Design a protein around this ligand. Sequence first.
Ligand SMILES: Cc1ccc(NC(=O)c2ccc(CN3CCN(C)CC3)cc2)cc1Nc1nccc(-c2cccnc2)n1
Length: 279
Amino acid sequence: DSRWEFPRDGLVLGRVLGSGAFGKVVEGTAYGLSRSQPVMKVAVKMLKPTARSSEKQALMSELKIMTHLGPHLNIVNLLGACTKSGPIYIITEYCFYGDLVNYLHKNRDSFLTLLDLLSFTYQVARGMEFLASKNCVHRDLAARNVLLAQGKIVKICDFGLARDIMHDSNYVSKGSTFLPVKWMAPESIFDNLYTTLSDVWSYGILLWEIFSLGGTPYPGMMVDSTFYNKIKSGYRMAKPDHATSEVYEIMVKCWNSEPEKRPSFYHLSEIVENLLPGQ
Ligand SMILES: Cc1ccc(NC(=O)c2ccc(CN3CCN(C)CC3)cc2)cc1Nc1nccc(-c2cccnc2)n1
């Protein structure tokens, strides 16, 4: 679709927001991208000189997925792309608060309120519901892949090539790659099965991050055969400090050993809605 093409001369590139071995996301300003706001801040994803054909394909593939998914309030939204006479650029909206983990850390003292945490929980479920409805499996759902926009609107994202998986402790080496094992369903780690149901397990881990104000899952527990054995044995985390007992129950239901026993994202949205004063 060429409806998304944006002239390169209308895009000003700024500071780096995220970077990996082969890709990066940078801050930007787009002129004429919008009739309403002719001077608009944006985020731009692009390859680095170090990248090869395999990565170029991946970026193009990512853009296709993005063009194909429709827009949703809770997914970072595509605004345009630069695909001619140059390296590909994917342009999205800019999220004022940045990633959720850093935001939560910055706000421990203010704690931002518990209702805010519940809203985040509700919004993520709605975004995931949207992705699931499109038969799209995320595979890396975590607070580090949740952005927060103005008005405290969560925006689910996937850094992808823009994440240094090799130097990030959250990702563990496996079969010539690194995986966020502490966030993955057992059937994913051990049986290479990825489904909307395995995303639900990650969502549970995400809720633990939210209600620990950005703590590390399985704190002090390194990833090894013992950790793997504990997970397979049905071991689950304790309740984080700021979680209520209903929020903890939700996490536990997301961590069921049997994927079919996990609630749907649509169901999760309704259960969380029942915890909110607002109807
Ligand atoms: C600029 C850009 C380009 C592409 C994307 N793409 C995605 O966020 C994304 C989300 C979901 C999918 C779906 N996909 C399904 C298949 N599985 C395996 C992967 C996920 C794909 C891409 C985001 C962005 N935006 C982005 N990315 C990282 C950080 C920021 C950012 C950072 C700070 C402040 N404001 C914005 N902004």
